[PDB]
Design a protein around this ligand. Sequence first.
Ligand SMILES: CCCCCCCCCC(=O)OC[C@H](COP(=O)([O-])OCCN)OC(=O)CCCCCCCCC
Lengths: 171, 87
Amino acid sequence: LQEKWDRLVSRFFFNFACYLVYMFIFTVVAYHQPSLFGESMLLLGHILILLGGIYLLLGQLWYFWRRRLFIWISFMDSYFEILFLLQALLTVLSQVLRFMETEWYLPLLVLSLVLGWLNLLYYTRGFQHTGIYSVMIQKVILRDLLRFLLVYLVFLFGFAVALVSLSREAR
Amino acid sequence: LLQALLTVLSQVLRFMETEWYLPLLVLSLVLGWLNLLYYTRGFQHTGIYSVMIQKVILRDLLRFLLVYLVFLFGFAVALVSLSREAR
Ligand SMILES: CCCCCCCCCC(=O)OC[C@H](COP(=O)([O-])OCCN)OC(=O)CCCCCCCCC
């Protein structure tokens, strides 16, 4: 597997560079959105976003068709692909809401940008130090964070209702 | 070396009477005060202390800074693009 990785690391970093360029183009267009030569350039950028989103969606759908049982077998090894699916369809969906000229095309684009920048952590498995780092971020800390969030949300809701009900009476 | 040439360079910018001689002097002062930690190797307790400040914590801090800068830039662009529309 070390020999196979040493032979395929050039394609790994090529995919990394393509994804980084796609997110740079997606960031530039989202930064220059109009109020809801420059217009033609923005339309070309939106076309490039739609093409990249369709490409990512088709690739992820092919992966899910080939590896349908892998999600049920191991969620902690097939979750980035899920994320690589999700924002991808969001990348499509917002553009659909751009075609209909509605209000909610911009929040979907913003969530697509955020989830795309969180999806850049996949390629950190290409290096050994960041690869060991990325193991802890979803394996051990996650269950503790979910139980802590559950207890904190219970306490927060109870105390919030308490201070709401107690502060209504004036002096 | 670095602040030392800065210590020269700012004075050169003092000879030419330009604007940027003061920021270079300030960075020279800051880097000079951070260079005082070398002589802490002259004592055993501070000498053991100075090992951890560049050996183990440094790589973790660089990878943390990389991930934090990625997240910070992405979220900053998100809140910039989302807050332009008024109520
Ligand atoms: C006009 C039609 C052209 C079709 C061919 C385009 C060239 C192929 C692009 C490509 O290499 O896609 C791979 C890249 C990473 O996905 P992943 O397999 O690592 O998935 C891993 C998931 N875990 O995925 C992406 O980066 C998607 C970006 C789409 C635009 C590419 C722009 C290239 C600029 C040079």
